[PDB]
């Protein structure tokens, strides 16, 4: 993949960059509890068929 940056094809000015990739790191991408299942139980009287 061609590693080009804007100053390669257009006239650029100077910019002091503040943005960071902090939130798109692998940890940060997955750092959320996600629902994987719902389990159903109950508490009724065990009777000959059920």
């Amino acid at each position: 993949t061609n590693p080009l940056v804007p100053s390669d094809t257009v006239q650029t000015r100077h910019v002091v960059q503040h943005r960071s990739r902090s939130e798109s790191s692998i940890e940060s991408f997955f750092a959320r509890g996600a629902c994987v299942t719902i389990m159903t139980v109950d508490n009724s009287a065990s009777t000959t068929n059920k």
């Binding site: 804007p6 257009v10 006239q11 650029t12 000015r13 100077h14 910019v15 002091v16």
Partner: protein, 132 residues
């Protein structure tokens, strides 16, 4: 000033335009900040900016309005009021983004026998109310 100079008498020059006034009440610099160009630390669009300089940073006179006993007041918005003003308006419409500061000079003379007082206000984000 013992050699003459005064608060009331100013000369402003920008580009090919000069304003004189012999009856000023000093000048105001909003929030004490003089207009400036965008700094690299604060820059955002990465392309080489267009800077029109004297071609656009000069004095444009708008249409003279008339004050009377029934006048309730007037308003304008910037940059809108200057959208058709020479090379400033052109640079404005050719580009997606733009920034500008302004020297606003309001002119109203009368006579030692007239009276009245106009309040001149520069409002940041002057959102006005609708008719509905």
């Amino acid at each position: 000033e013992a050699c003459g100079y005064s608060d009331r008498v100013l000369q402003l020059t920008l580009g090919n335009s000069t304003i004189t006034t012999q009856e000023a009440a000093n000048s105001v610099v909003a929030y004490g900040r003089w207009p400036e160009y965008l700094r690299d630390s604060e820059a955002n669009p990465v392309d080489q900016p267009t800077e029109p300089d004297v071609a656009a940073c000069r004095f444009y006179t708008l249409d003279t309005v008339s004050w009377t006993k029934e006048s309730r007041g007037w308003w304008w918005k910037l940059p809108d009021a200057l959208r058709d003003m020479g090379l400033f308006g052109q640079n404005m419409y050719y580009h997606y983004l733009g920034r500008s500061g302004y020297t606003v000079h309001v002119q109203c003379n009368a006579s030692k026998f007239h009276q009245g007082a106009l309040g001149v206000f520069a409002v940041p984000e002057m959102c006005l109310a609708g008719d509905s």
